[PDB]
Amino acid sequence: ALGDTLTITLGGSGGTAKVLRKINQDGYTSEYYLPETSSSFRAKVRHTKESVKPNQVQYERHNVEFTETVYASGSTPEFVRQAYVVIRHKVGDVSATVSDLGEALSFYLNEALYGKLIGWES
Amino acid sequence: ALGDTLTITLGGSGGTAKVLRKINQDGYTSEYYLPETSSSFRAKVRHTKESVKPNQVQYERHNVEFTETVYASGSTPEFVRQAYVVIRHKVGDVSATVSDLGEALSFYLNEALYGKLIGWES
Amino acid sequence: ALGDTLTITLGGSGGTAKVLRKINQDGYTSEYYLPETSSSFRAKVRHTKESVKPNQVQYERHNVEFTETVYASGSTPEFVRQAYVVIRHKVGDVSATVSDLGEALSFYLNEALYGKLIGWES
Amino acid sequence: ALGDTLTITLGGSGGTAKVLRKINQDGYTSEYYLPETSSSFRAKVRHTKESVKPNQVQYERHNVEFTETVYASGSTPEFVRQAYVVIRHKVGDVSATVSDLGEALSFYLNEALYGKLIGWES
Amino acid sequence: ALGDTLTITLGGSGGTAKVLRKINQDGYTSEYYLPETSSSFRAKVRHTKESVKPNQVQYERHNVEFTETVYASGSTPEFVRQAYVVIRHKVGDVSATVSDLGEALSFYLNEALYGKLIGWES
Amino acid sequence: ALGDTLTITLGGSGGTAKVLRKINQDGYTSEYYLPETSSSFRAKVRHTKESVKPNQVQYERHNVEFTETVYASGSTPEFVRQAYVVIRHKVGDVSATVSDLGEALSFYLNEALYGKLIGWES
Ligand SMILES: [Ca+2]
Ligand SMILES: [Ca+2]
Ligand SMILES: [Ca+2]
Ligand SMILES: [Ca+2]
Ligand SMILES: [Ca+2]
Ligand SMILES: [Ca+2]
Ligand SMILES: [Ca+2]
Ligand SMILES: [Ca+2]
Secondary structure, eight states: OOOSEEEEETTTTTSOEEEEEEEEEOSSEEEEEEEOSSEEEEEEEEEEEOOOOTTSOOEEEEEEEEEEEEOOBTTBOOEEEEEEEEEEEETTOOHHHHHHHHHHHHHHOOHHHHHHHHTTOO | OOOSEEEEEETSTTSEEEEEEEEEOOSSEEEEEEEOSSEEEEEEEEEEEOOOOTTSOOEEEEEEEEEEEEOOBTTBOOEEEEEEEEEEEETTOOHHHHHHHHHHHHHHOOHHHHHHHHTTOO | OOOSEEEEEETSTTSEEEEEEEEEOOSSEEEEEEEOSSEEEEEEEEEEEOOOOTTSOOEEEEEEEEEEEEOOBTTBOOEEEEEEEEEEEETTOOHHHHHHHHHHHHHHOOHHHHHHHHTTOO | OOOSEEEEETTTTTSOEEEEEEEEEOSSEEEEEEEOSSEEEEEEEEEEEOOOOTTSOOEEEEEEEEEEEEOOBTTBOOEEEEEEEEEEEETTOOHHHHHHHHHHHHHHOOHHHHHHHHTTOO | OOOSEEEEEETSTTSEEEEEEEEEEOSSEEEEEEEOSSEEEEEEEEEEEOOOOTTSOOEEEEEEEEEEEEOOBTTBOOEEEEEEEEEEEETTOOHHHHHHHHHHHHHHOOHHHHHHHHTTOO | OOOSEEEEEETSTTSEEEEEEEEEEOSSEEEEEEEOSSEEEEEEEEEEEOOOOTTSOOEEEEEEEEEEEEOOBTTBOOEEEEEEEEEEEETTOOHHHHHHHHHHHHHHOOHHHHHHHHTTOO
C-alpha cells in the first residue's frame, strides 16, 4: 500500500519530480509508469522470500528499481538509464536494525559519489 | 579515488559511523572491511561493462554493497544483513543525467520507506 | 487511476448508467463487474507490449472490452453481447496524436452507424 | 452501402476530417484509403459469422478499423497508428440493444480516457 | 476495489484498532498485513465460483479471514488465532437478501456467544 | 448448553427475526430448524479438535452456519443461501483474546461490506 503514485525526483531533493502512476500489482509487486515525450519513467517494487533450504537461514529480499527509457532519436537508438536497490535480511531480523543499513547506504550514495562511480573509481 | 576508508553510517545521517578500511582491490572491484567481536562489516564496489553485441547498446553497471555479518551465537546461527545498489547506463551516456537518477533513488529511500518495504508494502 | 468504478452508459450519453466495480487487476489488466438477476456486466482493460524484434518497430496495444452476459432462461441458452476497442501505436509515439485517432473512431461510431453495421452494410 | 467515402475526423468532432475513398469491397468487407504526403489513412469495415458449432449459440462479429501509416523519415523508420472496434452478438439478438452497448463504449472512450490508457492506467 | 488498508478492531466496536496494509491482490484475492513486535496480523479475502455442474445450480463463495500469528517465545512455540467467514449463494441471487443473512450471522455472533463457542457449548 | 431456540435476525439488528427450534444435538454439534411456506432456515454449530500431531500445536475449530433453503418454484429449482463462521485457536489459548478477534470480524462484516463481497470486490 505505497500509494497510487510514486514520485521520482531527479537530481535528488532538488527538484524535477516525475510522478508515476501505479500500472500493475501482482505477486507482492507494484509497477508505476510515466510516458513522457522523449523518454518514459518506470519504477518497480518487489518483495521476495529466498528459497528455503534444510540447515540454513532463510532470507527475504526487497527491491526498488527506477528506469528511464530514452526513445530512439534519429540515428541514435533507444537506450536506458537505470538504478536500483536491494535489501536482504534473514526472516525475523530486527527491522529497525535492517532499516539502519541501507538508510546508511542512501546516505553514502550522493551526487559526488555517483560521479566517482561512473568514473569507475573504487 | 573513492577513498582508503569507507564509512557506513548506520541509521543514516547522524547515525553510528562504522569506518571500514580498503583491504583488497581486484577486477575493477574494491573491498572495505571492519571487523568487530560480534559481527563484521564489509563494503564492496563493483564495475562491469556488459559485452558488445552486434546490434545493441552496450551498458555499464556500477554496484555498491554493504554487508553486516553477524557471527553465530549460541543456538542462533550466523546470518547477514545486506543492502546494495546498482546503477546501469549505456556507455557514452551523460554522467550528470545518470547521477541524477541515482540521487532520485537515494532520496526516495528513507527510513519511513524502508519501514514500509520490510512490511511488504508494494 | 482510471477509477474504482467504471460506468457503462447503455444507449450512449444520457442512456442507462450501469456502474461496475473493479474486482480484479492482474497482468496489466483490470476487470470491473456488476452482477444483476437476469444478466451481468463486465468490463476489461488490457495493455500489451508486442515483443522487441531485431529490425522492427515495437508496438503497444490498449484494449477495452464491454460484455453483457445474459443468463440462460427457459429454452433460450445463455449468450452474450460484446463490444471492444483496440488502440495500437509504436512505443515512443506522440500520445496526443494517437489519442486523436481513437477520438476519431469514437466519433465515427454512433447509433446510426452501429445500425448499418449490424445490417451488414459495408 | 456505407457510401463511397468515409471520413475520419482526427481529434474527434473537432475537426481535421480526412475523407477516404472506397478502394475495395469483397466478402462483406469495404476498404477506404487516402494517401497524403507524409502519411496515409486507411479504414476497413468487416462483417463475420463466427464458426457454427453443434450445441452452442452462434455469433456475428462486426469490425471497423482506422489506420494511419507514417512513412519513414530519414533515419526514423516507417510506423503505424491504429484503432479499431469489434462488436459481437448472437445471431438474432435485438439490434437496438446491441447498438446500445458500444454506443456506450464510444461514449466512454474520449480524449481524457485515451490519455489514461496510453499511460497504461487500468 | 477494497482499499489500501483494512482495520481489525480487536474486541469489536470501540476495541483496539489494528490497521493492516494491503500487501497483494491477485486471483480475485486480497491480502493485508501488519507485522508487530510480538505478533503479526493478516487478513485475506477470496472469491470463488464453485464447479459448474450439468443439471445443478451454480454457486459463488465469498471468504474473509483474520489471522493473528504469535511468534515463538522461549519454550512457547509459534501459534495462530483465526476467524473467518464464508458466504455462499447461487449466481443471480438477490444481493440484498443474501446480505441480510450475513448480517444476521454477524449480529448473532457477539462476545457472549464467542465465549460459549470457545467453551464448547453446543 | 445453547438453548431451545436460536434467532436469526435477517438484515442484522432490528431486522426480521426467525426463531429456529433446536432439532438435535450430538457430536458436540447442534442443529436448529424453522420450516416455512416457501423456504426453511437451519443453523448448525460444530466443535472440532484438529488432528493432534507430534511436534506441533493442537488446534480447535468452532463453526456456526446459517442456511436458508428456498424450495423449488415452478421452473426455478431449489437453492440455498449460506453464511458461516469458523474460529480456530490452539488448546490453552486465552479465550478473551481469541474472542476479541471474532468480535473484530463480526464488527468488520457489515451490510456495506457484504455488498462489496457479493460484488466480487477483492
Ligand atoms: Ca544532480
Ligand atoms: Ca494483481
Ligand atoms: Ca534508523
Ligand atoms: Ca440507442
Ligand atoms: Ca484530441
Ligand atoms: Ca468485390
Ligand atoms: Ca472482547
Ligand atoms: Ca440488509
